[PDB]
Design an enzyme around this catalytic site. Structure first.
Site, mmCIF file in Angstrom:
data_model
loop_
_atom_site.group_PDB
_atom_site.id
_atom_site.type_symbol
_atom_site.label_atom_id
_atom_site.label_comp_id
_atom_site.label_asym_id
_atom_site.label_seq_id
_atom_site.Cartn_x
_atom_site.Cartn_y
_atom_site.Cartn_z
ATOM 1 C CG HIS A 98 -5.779 -2.372 0.960
ATOM 2 N ND1 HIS A 98 -5.130 -2.208 -0.247
ATOM 3 C CD2 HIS A 98 -5.226 -1.476 1.811
ATOM 4 C CE1 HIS A 98 -4.208 -1.269 -0.122
ATOM 5 N NE2 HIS A 98 -4.250 -0.806 1.117
ATOM 6 C CB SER A 132 -1.019 -0.062 1.139
ATOM 7 O OG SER A 132 -2.113 0.800 0.866
ATOM 8 C CD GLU A 162 -5.582 -4.127 -3.451
ATOM 9 O OE1 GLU A 162 -5.647 -3.839 -2.237
ATOM 10 O OE2 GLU A 162 -4.577 -4.665 -3.963
#
Ligand SMILES: *[C@@H]1O[C@H](CO)[C@@H](O[C@@H]2O[C@H](CO)[C@@H](O[C@@H]3O[C@H](CO)[C@@H](O)[C@H](O[C@H]4O[C@H](CO)[C@@H](O)[C@H](O)[C@@H]4O[C@H]4O[C@H](CO)[C@@H](O)[C@H](O)[C@@H]4O)[C@@H]3O)[C@H](O)[C@H]2NC(C)=O)[C@H](O)[C@H]1NC(C)=O
Ligand SMILES: *[C@@H]1O[C@H](CO)[C@@H](O[C@@H]2O[C@H](CO)[C@@H](O[C@@H]3O[C@H](CO)[C@@H](O)[C@H](O[C@H]4O[C@H](CO)[C@@H](O)[C@H](O)[C@@H]4O)[C@@H]3O)[C@H](O)[C@H]2NC(C)=O)[C@H](O)[C@H]1NC(C)=O
Ligand SMILES: *[C@@H]1O[C@H](CO[C@@H]2O[C@@H](C)[C@@H](O)[C@@H](O)[C@@H]2O)[C@@H](O)[C@H](O)[C@H]1NC(C)=O
Ligand SMILES: CN(C)c1ccc2nc3ccc(N(C)C)cc3[s+]c2c1
Ligand SMILES: CN(C)c1ccc2nc3ccc(N(C)C)cc3[s+]c2c1
Lengths: 532, 532
Positions: B437, B197, B324
């Site tokens: 995610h 990320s 995500e």
């Protein structure tokens, strides 16, 4: 005698015609207006002066002056649509097929030919009304109307060439039918107007126009609707094209009177020879002289009329073919030819998009391109070809019709929608063109009932089914038989949006005809072009 | 002793830690910079002053000051990501896991934590490097860096708070590793940086930034790329947010010096308490204090650097998870909640689109809506939910990464792309969130090898396969074994665009990861917003 009918305009004598081992009556080439010649070119039509004696209505009339397609000389696929009579400005006639013995008061159907408002004839083999009249016991009328500059040259403000006079030709034939069809056994309070392409657009235009509404009961639109992007222009664009026509013929352009007088001195073929030079853009599915939004025939913009329910409220039956676009890609778009599979490269795809949406900026063109490209396989020539085919069909026919359908149904008294997707077994056009613009007509007019024309038995059955839907709808406002074994063609509603397919396979009901694509064409793209 | 290492900064003493019935060494909480406290808050980091004696590196360090998620108190799914040590501004430390016996010169991997640049800790259970170090015989480093205003408050032109100092923290840890990892048995010419990320975005930023390029060999980016819409701001927007922060804390705003002095007098929690008030739009997947395009760390715009090949040319391995977006819809978008299936109405879908693309005009929002709506079934709450999930994932993670991938691969020395789509069997989050995610990380760090954590045998095998791909890539620039029975993870190329999936099923190769959607996000939508 059964071939002799006295009308309000005078006596007509018809002819007995054979049809599927029986006979019916035909009254061919009946005048409904004065010849629009000389100083009457471009003018509104005048009613035909009544005649004494007997009008010989035994043969087809002249076709109106028009561009003649010679792209494929000798080829039946194209020449089947060309004029089959001598062309003349003296062309305002109608044809009537009447069952035998003569009915007393039966369902009337009035056919309005297409041809992009630049062409068309009432007399084509494929429009022979005898099979429909005989099989469904209806009085079948076909009318004519001026096309090209002759029918649609528009110099708004002038009474000599106001525009829309071809639509006024149609209206006068409808007035004539309304006033006289009773003498041929027709019921004038049960007249259905029907037409394909520009004819379908024309039908929808008579639904909209206050001065046409009272002359018919219900309507059928085939592959055409009045709001189609090609079917009308503004007064300013009409004016510009008329002036550009004059410029092409070395006319004096100082006034409307000078321009019009010059255009009236020209032979018809001189006008036709430069007709295609006045389009504003390099484009496909665009025609020079079309109806004009004048504030008279059309009191306001078509969209405001549709949103406010300013139209005849009745039953409509309408639909489209699967591959409406293919004809128009063949005639102009690079990469497409008659004798190849026409696999299209990315570059020719891009060129095709530009031609298909001539009024669009680059962002608009990108939006269309994105929407119709499979990005997992963007060099597939079949997918590019078929994607372009869909672009042209969706933009010019299907999505305008779906917009019209949805707007009409809020106020109307019953909508029935079809998707015609049978490719005839005897088509001379190549396979890639699919279910071509105009090739449901032969099923509507019953030609598959003639053995000599090489249709299958399944195609004969499809034609009978379509003829009976059309005629039953014309008679009752519902294509379904009161008590039948067949499964129903359901009503199209705002909520459920149901339609049927028309083919040789058993009938299926579907919903929301090409809705994904038509949201793009009817809501997103216009909003995009308005913003940039 | 194996737990005693002399570095260029001084001696450190580590601790023996157990791991899967064996042991390795760990050197936890090694300082790589001076504490950035007092007048050093917001400043670029200074190198740590060398110490005499032995630094006790037996325990984890403090975590950096940050917002603490309390949306689901007691819930492991959320608190697993929160700080597990005391928070402090004195937080610039790194952790090293070293195989036993100590290697001489082996592959080094340096982990950079995510958390939207507003949060993150090197010390999370899920980042425990022992399993990876032990199983793949690598020296595993995890670094830390300042987050929030502390790491990214940006008043460009000022040397007291220039911005990007959290990235400079990362770079200093990388400098430290480069200079000292040899003493722990690491090979400093074979260092792979990897992160998820904001950590993945950070990795890509060190690839781009000239001053970071020389400190590592190759890179792995998980669910993040430097060009992500949330990962950077202009100098003007950074400036505006910093001033807005000051306005929230009643600061004197007459000069940069006045503003900065005020912000330094505040306790850390006072800054954190108003941090989210400075966003310009009502939005999801947007964070207040992030890297800034300054003309120093980033010499020019990220896009111009990418188009011109202005970046480190090496091998990269990178990829994304299937869902995500779901985390970010749960935390703010109306209609989404943790304990329901979160079926979304049309209205909440529209609201979700607005929040997902805050920088868009109405035409832009319409374009997104059209692109992700099934118009045959637009009231399906599952489809609206999943469509929104895709919007958020595509826009914020997948499509920015695919743009980066395609740009990098023109100039790079080898790209390997993955799509991770296994939902862990022991996930505490609801099913609708899918493959969330950050939930590949636990497979990368080898947690499924621990029986007590309730993974399946198939999940253990997936983790071993992923760890070995990662480590083999780190070692050689290729995740594939020179001679293996397994089918290959193919190279990603401009022409063929191949990638693999990562799951418990047998591996499949695919092409052009979500290309349809990413053409919309990377080419059409920007062009649309630029035009209107
Ligand atoms: C239903 O199906 C049946 C069976 O398939 C169809 O019946 C046939 O129709 C075709 C017509 O397309 C016919 O083909 C002709 O056969 C002739 C005899 O062999 C040929 O001489 C003739 O060739 C001429 O025309 C061609 C163009 O069509 C030219 O390419 C060729 O050069 C020839 O042109 C000559 O014409 C001029 C003018 O006369 C002459 O002066 C020159 O010398 C010049 O060379 C056609 O190929 C078949 O023979 C028919 N088959 C059968 C079994 O009957 C029928 O058409 C279908 N019906 C419908 C309604 O579609
Ligand atoms: C096309 O148009 C025709 C003619 O306009 C139309 O037929 C009409 O349908 C309506 C239904 O809306 C009928 O109206 C009903 O008439 C009966 C008997 O006269 C009344 O009792 C009904 O009132 C009751 O039911 C109402 C609900 O519909 C309640 O609101 C009310 O409180 C009463 O309880 C009602 O007024 C009308 O009789 C017909 N007319 C004819 C001649 O058949 C047809 O529906 C239209 N078709 C389409 C597809 O639009
Ligand atoms: C009616 O007309 C029939 C055919 O019409 C004809 O067309 C004109 C242009 C000439 O070519 C003419 O020679 C054709 O006859 C006639 O066959 C029929 O006899 C006519 N009947 C009457 C009563 O006039
Ligand atoms: C039969 N169909 C579908 C079509 C479609 C488009 C067309 N466009 C033209 C443009 C110019 C032109 N000239 C003679 C200049 C002739 C034609 S003919 C033509 C026929
Ligand atoms: C853990 N994840 C994915 C997220 C995502 C978005 C978020 N947005 C916020 C906005 C305001 C706020 N305040 C305390 C005002 C807190 C949060 S927390 C938060 C956590």
């Amino acid at each position: 005698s059964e071939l002799l009918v006295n009308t309000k305009s005078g006596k007509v004598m018809g002819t007995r015609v054979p049809v599927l081992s029986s006979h019916i009556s035909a009254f061919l080439g009946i005048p409904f207006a004065e010849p629009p010649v000389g100083n009457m070119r471009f003018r509104r039509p005048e009613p035909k002066k009544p005649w004494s004696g007997v009008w010989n209505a035994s043969t087809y009339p002249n076709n109106c002056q028009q561009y003649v397609d010679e792209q494929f000389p000798g080829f039946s696929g194209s020449e089947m649509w060309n004029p089959n009579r001598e062309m003349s400005e003296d062309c305002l006639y109608l044809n009537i097929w009447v069952p035998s013995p003569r009915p007393k008061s039966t369902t009337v159907m009035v056919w309005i030919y297409g041809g992009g408002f630049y062409s068309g004839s009432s007399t084509l083999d494929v429009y022979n009304g005898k099979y429909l009249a005989y099989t469904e016991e209806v009085v079948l009328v076909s009318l004519s109307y001026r096309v090209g500059a002759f029918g649609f040259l528009a110099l708004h403000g002038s009474q000599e060439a106001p525009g829309n006079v071809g639509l006024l030709d149609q209206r006068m034939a409808l007035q004539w039918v309304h006033d006289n069809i009773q003498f041929f056994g027709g019921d004038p309070k049960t007249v259905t107007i029907f037409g394909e392409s520009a004819g379908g657009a024309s039908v929808g235009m008579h639904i909209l126009s206050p001065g046409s509404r009272d002359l018919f009961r219900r309507a059928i639109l085939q592959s055409g609707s009045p709001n189609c992007p090609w079917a009308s222009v503004s007064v300013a664009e009409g004016r510009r094209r008329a002036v550009e026509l004059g410029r092409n013929l070395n006319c004096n352009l100082n006034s409307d009177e000078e321009l019009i007088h010059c255009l009236r001195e020209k032979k018809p073929q001189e006008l036709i020879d430069v007709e295609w030079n006045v389009l504003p853009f390099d484009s496909i599915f665009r025609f020079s002289f079309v109806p004009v939004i004048d504030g008279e025939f059309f009191p306001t913009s078509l969209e405001s009329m549709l949103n406010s329910g300013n139209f005849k409220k009745t039953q409509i039956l309408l639909g489209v073919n699967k591959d409406e676009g293919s004809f128009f890609l063949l005639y102009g778009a690079p990469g497409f030819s008659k004798d190849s599979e026409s696999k299209i490269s990315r570059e020719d795809f891009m060129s095709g998009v530009k031609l298909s949406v001539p009024h669009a900026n680059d962002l608009g063109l990108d939006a269309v391109t994105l929407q119709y490209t499979d990005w997992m396989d963007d060099n597939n020539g079949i997918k590019n070809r078929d994607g372009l085919d869909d672009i042209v069909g969706d933009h010019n026919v299907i999505c305008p019709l779906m917009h019209f359908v949805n707007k009409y149904t809020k106020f109307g008294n019953g909508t029935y929608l079809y998707f015609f997707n049978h490719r005839a077994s005897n088509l001379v056009w190549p396979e890639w063109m699919g279910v071509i613009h105009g090739y449901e007509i032969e099923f509507v007019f019953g030609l598959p009932l003639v053995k000599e024309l090489n249709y299958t038995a399944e195609e004969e059955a499809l034609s009978r089914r379509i003829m009976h839907y059309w005629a039953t709808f014309a008679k009752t406002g519902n294509p379904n038989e009161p008590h039948s074994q067949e499964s129903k063609w359901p009503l199209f509603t705002t909520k459920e949006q149901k339609f049927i397919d028309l083919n040789t396979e058993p009938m299926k009901v579907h919903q929301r005809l090409r809705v994904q694509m038509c949201v793009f064409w009817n809501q997103f793209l216009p909003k995009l072009l308005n913003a940039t």
